[PDB]
Structures are given as structure tokens and as C-alpha cells.
Design a protein around this ligand. Structure first.
Ligand SMILES: C[C@](O)(COc1c(F)c(F)c(F)c(F)c1F)C(=O)Nc1ccc([N+](=O)[O-])c(C(F)(F)F)c1
Length: 247
């Protein structure tokens, strides 16, 4: 189980937001903590991605672009799984010190997106998603959103993606003889994977609008994040960069 050994080994540890939970909730404070957390997380996502089997096959410029475009979806997926395993989807577990209840969901002005993410979180339970299916699916999300014009080396990307889809096949094929059971499983998962994109899209839009009026809402945006939102996210919202759906 070489492939799974590796994913397990590189899976990031706990990342805290540094939020002050002794202070009443406020839009500004919550979003400032979400931005800070996002920035702390990106550092880990980058290190994780670069340690993924075959990732260095990609062109240097494609590596970062791919990481920045898929960043949101990866987090959404992981956060959903964390919510599932930690609080049984009761609340959104962004971090041990940044857990959202309905009040915070409403206060953050990200209610609709939070509700979709909670539903995703419940999906891991309804579908009895295994810890290993989760790891492979999350890896697959890194190769699920590219520019319409293609990357420097599209072919190496396509190869990479194809090989990851196959590993997911393998984790499903294991302990499964009847093809009809595997085909049904593959359907549910690819179907689950597709659902992540629309959620990331909504967060992107929310994040973009917020950055534009940040100076009006007293919301602090970290250096790196701001750059990605202003340079990368617009490409996604304008359609130049799009996700790869299964269905
Ligand atoms: C509002 C923002 O701070 C924006 O930061 C991000 C951003 F600007 C991006 F372009 C991203 F791709 C991204 F993943 C961000 F978090 C945010 O969505 N933060 C955030 C922090 C943690 C998590 N998390 O732990 O999964 C999430 C998420 F993914 F929505 F749930 C968002």
C-alpha cells in the first residue's frame, strides 16, 4: 500500500487560527481569523502538495498555479471531513480554535456557503467515506481545476491526474469483487467530488467581494492571500480557469 502510506505520511497536522474566543463575535474579528488561518493553512498545503507522488513531474509554474487554483476546494474538503470526524457535522471545524455554530455562520455573513459545507460534512457520514477514500479524493482535488488555455506542460498534468483517478479506483476495488458495487461506489464519490467545486466557487466570490471592500469593513488581508485573490481568483470567477468535472 505504497500510495496510501505516502498520503497518510504527508497529511498535515493540526493548524490553529489564533482566534480570541474570549471576545464576543463580530464580523471583522471572525473574518480576520479566517484569513489568518487560511494563510497558515496555505503554508501546509504547499508543503503537502510538493511531497505528493509525481508532483515534481509538473512544470515549476504549473505547480504553484495548480496549488493556488485548487487551494479553496482542498480546504473545503478537508474542513468538511474534520467537521465530520470531530463534531459529527454538528458545527464547522475550521480549526480547534475556530469552530462555527449557526450564530457564527450568520455573523460571518457566509451562511449559505457554511450550510453547503455542513451538508458536505454530513456526506462523509451518509456515504460512510473511509479515511483512505478521503485521502485519495483530497489528493485528486489538487488536479481538478485548470486554465482553459492549459498549463505549460498539460500532458504531464493529464498523466498525473489520470494516475490519481486510478489510485482512487484501487482503493475502491480493494475488498470489492462485484463490479456493480465498485461502479456504484465510484459514481457516488466522483459525484461527491464534483459537489466541492460549486462550494469553492461561492467562497471565492465571497472572498473576492470582501477583499475589494476590505478597507470599508476593517478586515485584514495577509500579504500572500491578497495577491492570490487579486491575481488568481479573478481568473476563476471570470472563467479563464475552470474545474474538471466528472459528470
Ligand atoms: C475568507 C477566507 O479567509 C479566504 O481565504 C482563502 C482565500 F482567499 C483563497 F483564495 C483560498 F483559495 C482559500 F482556500 C482561502 F481560505 C477563507 O475562506 N478562509 C478559510 C479558512 C479556513 C478554511 N478551512 O479551514 O477549510 C476555509 C474553508 F475552506 F472555506 F473552509 C476558509
Amino acid at each position: 500500500p505504497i500510495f496510501l502510506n505516502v498520503l497518510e505520511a504527508i497529511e498535515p497536522g493540526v493548524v490553529c487560527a489564533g482566534h480570541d474566543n474570549n471576545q464576543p463575535d463580530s464580523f471583522a474579528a471572525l473574518l480576520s481569523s479566517l484569513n489568518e488561518l487560511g494563510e497558515r493553512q496555505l503554508v501546509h498545503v504547499v508543503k503537502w502538495a510538493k511531497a505528493l507522488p509525481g508532483f515534481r513531474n509538473l512544470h515549476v509554474d504549473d505547480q504553484m498555479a495548480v496549488i493556488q487554483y485548487s487551494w479553496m476546494g482542498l480546504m473545503v474538503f478537508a474542513m468538511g471531513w474534520r467537521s465530520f470526524t470531530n463534531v459529527n457535522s454538528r458545527m464547522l471545524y475550521f480549526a480547534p480554535d475556530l469552530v462555527f455554530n449557526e450564530y457564527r455562520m450568520h455573523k460571518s455573513r457566509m451562511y449559505s456557503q457554511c450550510v453547503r459545507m455542513r451538508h458536505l460534512s454530513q456526506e462523509f457520514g451518509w456515504l460512510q467515506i473511509t479515511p483512505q477514500e478521503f485521502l485519495c479524493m483530497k489528493a485528486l482535488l489538487l488536479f481538478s481545476i485548470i486554465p482553459v488555455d492549459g498549463l505549460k506542460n498539460q500532458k504531464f498534468f493529464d498523466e498525473l491526474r489520470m494516475n490519481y483517478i486510478k489510485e482512487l479506483d484501487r482503493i475502491i476495488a480493494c475488498k470489492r469483487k462485484n463490479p456493480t458495487s465498485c461502479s456504484r461506489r465510484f459514481y457516488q464519490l466522483t459525484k461527491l467530488l464534483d459537489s466541492v467545486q460549486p462550494i469553492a466557487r461561492e467562497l471565492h466570490q465571497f472572498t473576492f467581494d470582501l477583499l475589494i471592500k476590505s478597507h470599508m469593513v476593517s478586515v485584514d488581508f495577509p500579504e500572500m492571500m491578497a495577491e492570490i485573490i487579486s491575481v488568481q481568483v479573478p481568473k476563476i470567477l471570470s472563467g479563464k480557469v475552470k474545474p474538471i468535472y466528472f459528470h
